[PDB]
């Protein structure tokens, strides 16, 4: 009933506490930061660290609850602010204009909206995200020491394992009402939004890493190879970028709901 949420620690005694998603999601970054192609290194070989694939898992579904907290308090708060105390005839609600409780509904269903979009996207991208992981890890089954100064790998079969990725991208749909337009300036150019509502990932990134193989077989001396593994290895650092950019973006809207509804819940009190 009485939908309390005046302060960060009303927040989290009601479990809306946006360190969590944010540090979760920080961990796979960290994650996929750590993630590393095997290398050579003064005539010895070094296998790399495969995905720790549980580390992503933690991410979403985090920030799958959080949407869930945010968006029980924001119904707890719109219960408490539509009606409360009763006169004689009137159900008030967008038939007899004038007060400005109906303005702030209107303020709370974009606070609904924005919660579903962001963790919808968010939900994606971390597919998308730990996708890409699991190819980093799955293709270093195709590379390994020939000579103690060459090394194999089948590019051919790599390409195979990034094109998978690129077939099967995750794709996300915006609520119903969304001002598209908004939304494709805020993402940036990471991602693409139909007219439909319909978010997709850019797959250029995954491009470049695909393009970038040998065929199967290939034998590479040290040089080439290293060559290969940072031009490989910046794009995925490419990846990474685009990930937490909208990692920020989405703990600001975190922030952005923590905000509101303290205003509404000082707002409820004013017209209480």
Same mark, same amino acid.
């Given at each position: ?9 009303? #927040?989290?005694?009601? =479990? ?12 796979? *970054? ?10 050579? *290194?003064?005539?010895? &070989? ?25 968006? $029980? ?11 409360? @105390? ?8 967008? +038939?007899?204009?004038?007060? *400005?409780?109906?303005? #702030?509904?209107?303020? /709370? ?11 919808? /996207? ?27 100064? $060459? ?14 990725? *690129? ?9 119903? =009402?969304?001002? +598209? ?6 993402? =940036? ?6 007219? %439909?509502?319909?978010?997709?990932? $850019?797959?250029?990134?995954? +491009?470049?890493?695909?393009? %970038?193989?040998?065929?199967?077989? @290939? ?12 031009? &490989?290895? =910046?794009?995925?650092?490419? /990846?990474? $970028? ?8 989405? %703990? ?15 707002? +409820?009190?004013?017209? @209480?």
């Amino acid at each position: 009933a009485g939908a309390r949420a005046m302060t960060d620690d009303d #927040l989290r005694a009601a =479990g809306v506490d946006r360190r969590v998603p944010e540090q979760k999601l920080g961990a796979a *970054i960290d994650e996929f930061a750590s993630l590393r192609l095997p290398d050579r *290194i003064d005539g010895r &070989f070094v296998d790399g660290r495969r995905a720790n694939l549980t580390v992503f898992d933690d991410a979403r579904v985090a920030v799958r609850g959080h949407a869930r907290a945010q968006r $029980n308090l924001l119904e707890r708060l719109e219960t408490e602010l539509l009606g409360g @105390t009763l006169d004689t005839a009137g159900d008030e609600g967008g +038939i007899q204009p004038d007060p *400005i409780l109906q303005g #702030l509904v209107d303020v /709370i269903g974009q606070g609904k909206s924005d919660i579903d979009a962001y963790a919808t /996207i968010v939900e994606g991208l971390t597919k998308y995200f730990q996708s890409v992981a699991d190819v980093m890890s799955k293709l270093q089954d195709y590379i390994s020491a020939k000579d103690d100064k $060459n090394m194999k790998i089948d590019g051919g079969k790599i390409k195979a394992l990034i094109q998978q990725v *690129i077939d099967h991208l995750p794709t996300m749909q915006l609520p119903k =009402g969304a001002d +598209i337009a908004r939304w494709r300036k805020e993402l =940036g150019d990471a991602v693409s939004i139909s007219d %439909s509502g319909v978010v997709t990932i $850019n797959p250029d990134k995954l +491009i470049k890493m695909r393009d %970038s193989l040998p065929p199967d077989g @290939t034998v590479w001396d040290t040089a080439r190879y290293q060559a290969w593994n940072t031009a &490989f290895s =910046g794009q995925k650092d490419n /990846i990474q $970028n685009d990930v937490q950019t909208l990692v920020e973006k989405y %703990s600001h809207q975190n922030s952005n709901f923590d905000n509101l509804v303290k205003v509404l819940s000082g707002a +409820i009190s004013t017209l @209480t």
